Amino acid sequence: MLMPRRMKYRKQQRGRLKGATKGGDYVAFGDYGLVALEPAWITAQQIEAARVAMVRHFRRGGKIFIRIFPDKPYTKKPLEVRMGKGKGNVEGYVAVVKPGRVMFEVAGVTEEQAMEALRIAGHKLPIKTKIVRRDAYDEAQ
Amino acid sequence: PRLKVKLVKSPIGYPKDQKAALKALGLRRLQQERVLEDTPAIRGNVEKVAHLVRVEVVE
Amino acid sequence: RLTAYERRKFRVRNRIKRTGRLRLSVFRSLKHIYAQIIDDEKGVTLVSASSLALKLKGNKTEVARQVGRALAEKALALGIKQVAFDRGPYKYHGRVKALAEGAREGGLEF
Amino acid sequence: GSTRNGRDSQAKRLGVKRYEGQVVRAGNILVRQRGTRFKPGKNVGMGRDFTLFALVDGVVEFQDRGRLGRYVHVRPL
Amino acid sequence: MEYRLKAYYREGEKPSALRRAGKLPGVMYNRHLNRKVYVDLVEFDKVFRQASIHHVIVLELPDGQSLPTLVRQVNLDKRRRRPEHVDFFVLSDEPVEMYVPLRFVGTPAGVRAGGVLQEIHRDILVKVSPRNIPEFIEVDVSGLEIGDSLHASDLKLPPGVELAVSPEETIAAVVPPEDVEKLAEEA
RNA sequence: CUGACUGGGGCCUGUAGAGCACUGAUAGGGCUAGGGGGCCCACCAGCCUACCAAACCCUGUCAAACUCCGAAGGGUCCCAGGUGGAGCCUGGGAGUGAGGGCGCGAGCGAUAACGUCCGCGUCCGAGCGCGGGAACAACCGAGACCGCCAGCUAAGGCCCCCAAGUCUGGGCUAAGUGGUAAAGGAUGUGGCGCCGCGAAGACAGCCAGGAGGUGGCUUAGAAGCAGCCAUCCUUUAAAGAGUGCGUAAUAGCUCACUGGUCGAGUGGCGCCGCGCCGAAAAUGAUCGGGGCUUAAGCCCAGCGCCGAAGCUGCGGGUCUGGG
RNA sequence: CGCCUCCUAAAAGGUAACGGAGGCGCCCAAAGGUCCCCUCAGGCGGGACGGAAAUCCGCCGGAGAGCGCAAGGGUAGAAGG
RNA sequence: CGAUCAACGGAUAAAAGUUACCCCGGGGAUAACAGGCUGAUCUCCCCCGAGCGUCCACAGCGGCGGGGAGGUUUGGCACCUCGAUGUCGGCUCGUCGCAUCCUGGGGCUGAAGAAGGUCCCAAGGGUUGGGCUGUUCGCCCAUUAAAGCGGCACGCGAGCUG
RNA sequence: UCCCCCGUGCCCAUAGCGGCGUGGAACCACCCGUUCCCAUUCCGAACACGGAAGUGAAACGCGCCAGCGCCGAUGGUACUGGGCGGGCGACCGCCUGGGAGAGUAGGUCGGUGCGGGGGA
């Protein structure tokens, strides 16, 4: 699934999550958006799962907008190994997300369809979210 | 002006720098007052330990 | 964007500015040759000689002997003796070189 | 597993040693740098390793010139 | 249209308080004036939802001033997705640049063919007269199929209006849909 | 007098932040090389490609090893304060070189560990001396010379145990929450704000009817409740070639809808506080217990009071310095 | 297991981990000194062989090239040729 | 000038293994058992509902993902114990939890009845004998209403065995 | 003392790129040759010398333009010293001091010194 095709560093540190969504915090492309409401990571399995859920619910028309990309290499050691002796392997590619992030934008869809599909995608994701709409706030963005 | 200074909280557990600021004002124990002229330096330390100490502007 | 000319000029003049002694700027036009000494720490042109002002003629190089001696003489009137010869973007030869000679020939130190 | 990584060179302690408005003696190190982060100027000589040092005595004088990079000056007393 | 709103002059009050008081911190200005101001949060929300950047906004100043102005910029609490400060561009004379809305009049025939209309730019960048600001520029979106898009080189503008962007800068595209028909191949 | 510390000033920094100007990553477009395809097809090119796809452009992002920038802060020099179990120099003697908890900033780890490893601060260590926290080294208060049957206070408490208010005013909770956990769910409750219709009368209970040719892709022969291709006007409340049962057949029920009978809210939104479920481990339970419901819970506001070895008062001891 | 570069490393320095990355155990008699002279990469367009890219030319280029080798820093107003 | 004195501040100019035949000093500074913290893994349980289920998401189901609980697995850490905390298994004796196998009650059903499936309440009682194997475990034999999962230092050696 | 030019300088783009116009009195440049000085990894291109036929075409000088670029407010906020709490945690609030980058407004088609020459 979603994963950087190449990177200057395979492994990578974890880092802090404190702060707000730096960029991409307004409805930019789609009509409706599912903003995060709590800082957390998301795996490409999670993101892609939520996308597949959305495309299922829509099932016709519309266009999912994945305004986040799982580039940070998630890392865990082999199971049942003592600590140390190097850093764990690249278990997967996650994407850090803070509150305010417009994670998903759906457009080309009725209101109710987009609202519901984004709701389901919210259930598929590990963070409390907030379906929203593009407004003059977004229009000013 | 002058500044009656009432040490009104222990310095234990606070960083040693703040304690040294207490020593700069000469404050040594709780409930200790010291009227000291409001100079930018002395008021510097006093502002540095405002949370620990009471500042009453006197003459 | 610079030129070989411009880059060369900053090249020599930086090389001489690094010294500290007075620089001897040298201008060599097609019909005239100009020269001067300046204190870079003051940005002040002290003495100014020029074929244009001196009203000379003949071999332009020989005219550089003329103005070289002249500027050397005025400088000696100013007492400045140790001074850096700025050949600028010019190749040290011909009019510029012989002018520097006339400054040496004029009794100046470099 | 193994570890390709895990090695690093000693610390160099590079950088500026004397700041502007700080009296110094001639021959003292100023900018233990790499390359010319500061270009030497008035009374500022530079060793082979780009190190800047006071040619004369006097005062440390830091002076940037924008496109002309950051200079250092020892202007005597 | 004219969307008025009472304007208040915050003097030195901490905007934490004013925001706490439902008073939206802000500032109106031009190349001549500049005033730290504050307005009602809920008022400016009500109006601004109608009174987005596309629309003239007339501040109802406390002294009686009524400046027909514009919100050149607005700060948003990323944590709450709430406004937190307004940049009132006091719309004086000397025609200035702003964002006009965009009217996709019709339907792309590819959208009629199942296509999905993606609006690249939902507003337009134009420097027009401050007192002759058109609020609409409709678009001939009928002659469009799936895979089609429009650019600045085709928008027809009213008099005194100026395209403030590249003519090649697109505005919207008719993209393929999102279909479960292509999903069972994906599961 | 130089010290810690402080103020003034100078300057050095690339971190957080931010941003894409470089490096890469990157979402979607435009455009478009180019390669893939289709014809064209070789005699060589050419037309299309909703194929991929350079580069660039736009929109949107991302970064510890990216930086067009960039704090707060930190470092240093000088000036000023700063007399302190301060500072500096030289000698003597050390012991220590297993540290740990806590907070913050990182790495590892699983953003797990009373984990590990670092930086900064702190405390314990050595202060398991004291009050609180029930009990508890590092959490809160507070650095114990001593004695006193004196007082003010700290954290924290004031319904009994147990000292101080069943103290005052205002709210909210009904779960013993309080007195344990999430996602998620919910006519819980309270309070907000927004929208709908409300007497050319609302929801509301009622009531009376609510349809036709009947026909179409006409076939699983149901014009309508079955798979779909459909959805004309009209039966002068006007109710659909229907919304769900009988319909490989009608029915009849009902519904949207037509009047009136009542006659005042009704209805739906989003926010906030406090609650409910979600919530199952192993000897007997428990908020520390008792018990606690306009609280003895939670939040806000007040005053007062209690409260230590803190401080103050008195008396004494002892060390340093000054007489 | 020694040394170099970077991040870790918290805008001074330093700073740990069997943390994240790579390098060195030489080379140049010129790849050193000095004097003088020149400026690249790259792209376009045109140009026999000849290409994508040889050499040529004109046009735009601040350094994105190069600088013996890792990285970084430095750098054309040269350390590059 | 002779250094892979590279274990690179370089113990000799000169040096590899094994010990269950072992011994001494120490260490809970440090592992194996247990206990402890975490719950990665493990068990269980909920969220979404794709799809299945003539149809019908939700009788039974539950893709993709998510959130939990527990603390029985294997793990991680190494905190007490290395001047001793006896380690698997079986026997005896039990006590307890409930995430209930049967027995009690109930809901729904894709429940005609019977037998069922699932879920809810329910821990009073019961939960067999044997073959194999050191085994627990598991398979099998024959039954049963059933032939529960676990905790109790993977209970129990100053109770047995070995 | 003013204007123009020519050389230098400092500030380091608001100073640059671009387009436009303009300069020959002087200055300068281009230029006219290469015997000489000097030179081309070929070439008078550059370099260098002698000279002034011609030209301001280029270059350069100066003005105009904000197209690019660059600079950039004010506010606001992120962020943070310090002191407080909250949160199981990831992380979050408050008071106190500082305070961005981004954008916005807007601003810039340079300022200034020295010397020389020319003109007023």
mmCIF file of C-alpha atoms in Angstrom, chain E residues 7-13 18 28 34-39 61-65 67:
data_model
loop_
_atom_site.group_PDB
_atom_site.id
_atom_site.type_symbol
_atom_site.label_atom_id
_atom_site.label_comp_id
_atom_site.label_asym_id
_atom_site.label_seq_id
_atom_site.Cartn_x
_atom_site.Cartn_y
_atom_site.Cartn_z
ATOM 1 C CA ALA E 7 -16.493 47.072 14.740
ATOM 2 C CA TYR E 8 -14.838 47.579 18.118
ATOM 3 C CA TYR E 9 -11.419 49.025 18.919
ATOM 4 C CA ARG E 10 -9.414 46.715 21.138
ATOM 5 C CA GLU E 11 -6.945 49.058 22.826
ATOM 6 C CA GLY E 12 -4.513 46.817 24.693
ATOM 7 C CA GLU E 13 -6.694 44.026 26.007
ATOM 8 C CA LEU E 18 -11.604 38.954 24.153
ATOM 9 C CA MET E 28 -8.499 46.655 9.853
ATOM 10 C CA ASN E 34 -4.195 50.460 11.077
ATOM 11 C CA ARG E 35 -6.351 49.683 14.109
ATOM 12 C CA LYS E 36 -6.302 46.816 16.567
ATOM 13 C CA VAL E 37 -9.979 45.899 16.661
ATOM 14 C CA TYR E 38 -12.257 43.140 17.850
ATOM 15 C CA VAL E 39 -15.674 41.912 16.821
ATOM 16 C CA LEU E 61 -17.502 51.279 13.740
ATOM 17 C CA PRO E 62 -18.371 52.511 17.243
ATOM 18 C CA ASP E 63 -17.724 56.158 16.369
ATOM 19 C CA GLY E 64 -20.163 55.790 13.465
ATOM 20 C CA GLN E 65 -17.615 54.881 10.808
ATOM 21 C CA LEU E 67 -15.771 51.209 6.207
#
